[PDB]
Design a protein around this ligand. Structure first.
Ligand SMILES: COC(=O)c1cc(O)c2cc(NC(=O)NCCCCNC(=N)NCCC[C@H]3O[C@@H](n4cnc5c(N)ncnc54)[C@H](O)[C@@H]3O)ccc2c1
Ligand SMILES: COC(=O)c1cc(O)c2cc(NC(=O)NCCCCNC(=N)NCCC[C@H]3O[C@@H](n4cnc5c(N)ncnc54)[C@H](O)[C@@H]3O)ccc2c1
Ligand SMILES: COC(=O)c1cc(O)c2cc(NC(=O)NCCCCNC(=N)NCCC[C@H]3O[C@@H](n4cnc5c(N)ncnc54)[C@H](O)[C@@H]3O)ccc2c1
Ligand SMILES: COC(=O)c1cc(O)c2cc(NC(=O)NCCCCNC(=N)NCCC[C@H]3O[C@@H](n4cnc5c(N)ncnc54)[C@H](O)[C@@H]3O)ccc2c1
Lengths: 343, 342, 343, 343
């Protein structure tokens, strides 16, 4: 039984790979110039890491990263993709006269057979909030094909978490559930479901961008080193935090973004999704507290963000947060698989 | 006395204490619409006052008696229960009108007058017209009115109209949601959120608003002071059927009133409607705890029931219904604890 | 089960997950044409419900059952297969109606009812009426209907008409021409342009539009739910012969539908036509691969063939020719994957 | 009852009506200085509470009792005379503390408490510390205090300082001069001007102010709640001799207060001084009838006599004199009828 199928509900995998089979989705991702230009720069400026080397491209989609590795001089690139996009990748490899160097291997990286070990693995394994889609585990799984000296592009990933204040976002989600307070919608009392409705809406992480002035403390960083991490490390991800509050006011939740670094032989190239940086198709992610916490400047906001992988290729998110000085505590559960796209 | 029988002593003490303050008198007198309109009603109907006997109920500083004197009254009995009666007597002497204005200290339900009067003047209107229950004292004073005497004001019109105001609703809704907190300094308050919502939404909101928030033609409820009895004001039932002109959320009902001075020379109107300059009565809005949705052309039907209480005010019951869909709203309000938002 | 034999498990999982969300219930309930017309149809035909036995197929939060209760029904069996069933149960208790509404979690093809019913109520219509294949569940439920029995809705009319929309047509190639460039970061993408075009044209466009784009009076295809059987919906052939009211280029066919509640006291209609206020069903347009020129008074004839698939939707095949000239066009579309264009 | 004999019914009615409102509880609870300081005082002196018996006098919604429970109190009697006692009970039940907090509706002068307590907690301070005459109920409750028990707060310090505020002084006459016109709609109002003036000057002004209007270091009058008897508060004679730090016109006296929680571990201070963040106690200013000129280095002497009355408040008689010149002034004010000037 493949490692992939054992961790993944089939109904989730069918939807997931159908979504990624669409050329329109490829175009959406490729037109992110920050993402595409930073990947090409990371590969081309570290060309010695690719010249005359064997490369594995995990989840290659249309194959763009494999074309970048070929531009950098790779001797051989195995491009693995499990969606039907694999067949379009083959078309581009032929139309670009790279049949001698790029070899598309359709299927899941956990189930294919690669002809040889590789010098470097390249991929775009990052989902929303970094961890969504559980692709990082496939990326890590692929290290079974990596030589001892081998490198990984990207090499590390940093998840950033910071408390924010945004009463408009909070009230927007809060009043959405207010529909269910009605004691007489067309004569029907709906209010018994108001609780369940508010929980539903607040379980959705909010995906959009925000002004960095809504952040109330320096971010906390949590780092995964892809060269050293193992698949199982991502089944349960525990991120403690202790924020030193820089402004007073209501904390409505935690904001999340991530950076990855391509640590090459010639230079390290960073790809950032921080709200201080140009927007990308990852945006940023915010998990709202069902009830905001009040904190004064100089207070400490401490707790834990716990991510439990689930069989729908995503994570159950638990956030418990505490204003230490007063003992005001907030607990929240979020379903990362189904965010609210607000942008 | 009729007054004491219907009034808790603690309420009456505070009430007449409030009206004893000259600053409160100044506040009402500086309302130029109020004072200029009353003077216009009296002076322009001077034939209803020339060489007549007048009763002024709750005269305060006495301004209306001075107006009656300017219009030619022969004798004016000015009745006032608060300590302001002594300041009014001071003004009568300083204005050399001791021969025409006779201040009688006391409650109009309790004092004695030496003769029947031709006309009664008063400012009995509180917030939403009925607050303070002064209209019953005004009506009670008709025991001193000659058989065809007049009353200034003569009639009163209460208007009510549904309104939409998401900001006002959310402001009160959000105040109450402080008690949703599961861990305020470590304490779960949420068990009291319902009670908080009740308390905040029982408060009539006294302020003014742009008329664009009104979603139907107002419905009018008329009290004819020449005809009504005290007891008519103990339980006031106001049915309403609104024909909706706009679609959206009805957050509550807005109230205002006009009074008419029906004199022999002219009728003169004093209006507190939102289409008119602001007065110290403002306008009053009763919020539904949950708004009702309605489309243009639906009818919004229900009843506003006012029951007088012994704190000189009213318990307000509003039941309303979108007839087409059966969406219903029931609400209770304490007119004596208004929220002054202006 | 009849439902499982016609439905891939992967499609059913996602389908019911979707209808488990209160936000989806909320969106449908806030469609005032939808909710208000159903209430009007039921209450104004109160003698079809007074002291009757009712079956509610796919009741969601249960609102149609509450309407049947407002109309005096003695017993209502409300069947719902998604997790929304648990929420309907809460509402039946909180509205003190456990004595009259019995919520039955499950597929109507799999549950058991204790007794036969006088009337079936349902909202089985999807996009283009037929999407979701819920009509078959509605018809299947007739095994529980008494010979006298009625159905609410009683009939459904699907309307087809030819439209001209130059801008909608050209948009497809503007999108696809993203791939028609020789050096996207060094890669020649042009070989995938044809596939990108093909992908866009297979999507029905869910949108509303101005009725002035219609070039001929609509043609109607009627399903009588009192007479139809499930298998009648596996292959739906809709012939058409449009008489062109205007000259121009025909870029596709527009779809909408009405249903009628044929009651003892009156017939009430729910219409999603572009001449009526917009509903959450919108309208649907299927483009032709190549536009067809027709002159006013010409005749545009052909067929729309809908073939049910196991993803709870239809493969759409449309063929059309202008009789006077012979110019012909086709198109194959996947109703399961509409393009939501509404703005 | 002691409370009955010192309080007119009309005043008591309105008083407990006012504190029956949850909006009033919310106002005080949302004062972070008030709420947070009480919490720190109790929590940071946990050895004063662990396994101890506690009396909470005038508990309102019950917050201090929950704090005493957080600190490990074995048992807490929470006494409240307003209808708010019913809401505190609800909160005790919802917080699963029925075993440790017992809510006693009624006046502390009239309830029966089952046993002596180790420590009394309360918030008995009104405007100017003494308004409302709650301190007497707090001291009366020491009939239930074990010998060697403690009081939280332990001491209260009222502060008096001379101030200059020309605009506040002139404002009285600008308001009264409304009456000084010969023909207000034809009526000569001028004979009431002097009465209007007198009315305004009887009112203490509740307001905050810039500390730069203060003309001398405050004089402090200390009540030690562990030693004082309730009779000590019936007549409070506060002598003062101010060493003027600035030259100018003295228009009246400013008042504020501090309280100290003198715990076994530490002492915590709650301050309403104008040098500190504003609280819902604000500050209080009593004008002299006429200003007194004083040079820096002069001494301003006199007395502030607070005479308790049956309206749960005080008559304030202030006499003051510039020693080096003999210039004297005075005023008599009704603390029950303050003018709230804050903007
Ligand atoms: C209402 O509708 C929903 O409910 C819904 C829910 C969502 O949440 C929605 C979210 C949306 N966007 C989004 O997520 N934007 C973030 C940008 C990430 C862009 N891509 C990436 N970096 N992700 C990871 C790489 C993926 C590639 O790798 C392949 N691949 C995976 N696994 C394997 C394997 N084992 N073997 C071989 N190949 C594999 C796979 O096929 C791909 O080609 C949009 C619509 C959404 C709709
Ligand atoms: C819960 O927070 C509170 O504590 C609170 C509550 C309120 O609701 C608050 C409301 C506030 N303003 C307000 O109401 N503005 C509307 C303008 C009304 C303008 N005056 C009028 N038309 N009132 C009726 C006539 C009164 C005169 O008639 C005398 N009078 C009464 N009865 C008798 C009697 N039997 N015999 C002889 N004389 C009698 C009485 O002494 C007076 O001179 C402010 C603060 C408030 C504070
Ligand atoms: C990007 O992401 C996608 O890929 C995607 C694809 C879509 O196309 C998307 C399309 C979207 N809108 C849409 O569809 N708008 C029209 C809907 C009309 C309103 N709903 C109705 N009338 N449908 C039919 C009734 C259904 C009820 O009946 C229940 N039910 C079904 N079967 C059974 C059974 N056997 N037993 C018992 N109960 C059953 C079921 O649970 C329900 O409660 C939105 C998001 C979409 C997302
Ligand atoms: C002239 O018009 C009036 O009439 C008037 C006069 C005023 O001056 C006005 C002043 C206003 N604001 C104000 O004061 N702002 C300062 C913040 C005070 C912050 N609260 C506090 N620390 N107060 C003392 C504790 C009270 C608690 O203790 C309870 N309690 C009392 N006695 C007993 C007893 N014997 N037994 C059991 N429980 C008892 C009581 O029920 C409470 O829960 C507003 C309206 C006012 C109206």
């Amino acid at each position: 039984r493949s490692v992939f199928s054992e961790r993944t509900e089939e109904s989730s995998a069918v939807q997931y790979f159908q979504f990624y089979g669409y050329l329109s989705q490829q175009q959406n991702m490729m037109q992110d110039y920050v993402r595409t230009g930073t990947y090409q720069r990371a590969i081309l400026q570290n060309h010695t890491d690719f010249k005359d080397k064997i490369v594995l491209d995990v989840g290659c989609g249309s194959g763009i990263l494999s074309f970048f590795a070929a531009q950098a001089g790779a001797r051989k690139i195995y491009a693995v993709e499990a969606s039907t996009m694999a067949q379009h990748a083959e078309v581009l490899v032929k139309s670009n006269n790279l049949t001698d160097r790029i070899v598309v291997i359709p299927g899941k990286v956990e189930e294919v057979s690669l002809p040889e070990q590789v010098d470097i693995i390249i991929s775009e394994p990052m989902g929303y909030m970094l961890f969504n889609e559980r692709m990082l585990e496939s990326y890590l799984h692929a290290k079974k094909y990596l030589k001892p000296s081998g490198n990984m592009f990207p090499t590390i990933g940093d998840v950033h978490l910071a408390p924010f204040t945004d009463e408009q976002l909070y009230m927007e989600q809060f009043t959405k559930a207010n529909f269910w307070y009605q004691p007489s919608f067309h004569g029907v009392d709906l209010s018994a479901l108001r609780g369940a409705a508010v929980d539903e809406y607040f379980r959705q992480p909010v995906v959009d961008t925000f002004d960095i002035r809504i952040l109330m403390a320096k971010s906390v960083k949590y780092t995964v080193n892809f060269l050293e991490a193992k698949e199982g490390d991502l089944h349960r991800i525990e991120i403690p935090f202790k924020f030193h509050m820089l402004h007073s006011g209501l904390v409505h939740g935690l904001a999340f973004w991530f950076d990855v670094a391509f640590i090459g032989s010639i230079m390290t190239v960073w790809l950032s999704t921080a709200p201080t940086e140009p927007l990308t198709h990852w945006y940023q992610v915010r998990c709202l507290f069902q009830s905001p916490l009040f904190a004064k400047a100089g207070d400490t906001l401490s707790g834990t963000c716990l991510l439990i992988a689930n069989k729908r290729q995503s994570y159950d998110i638990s956030i418990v947060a505490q204003v230490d000085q007063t003992g005001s505590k907030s607990s929240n559960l979020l379903d990362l698989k189904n965010p609210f796209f607000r942008y």
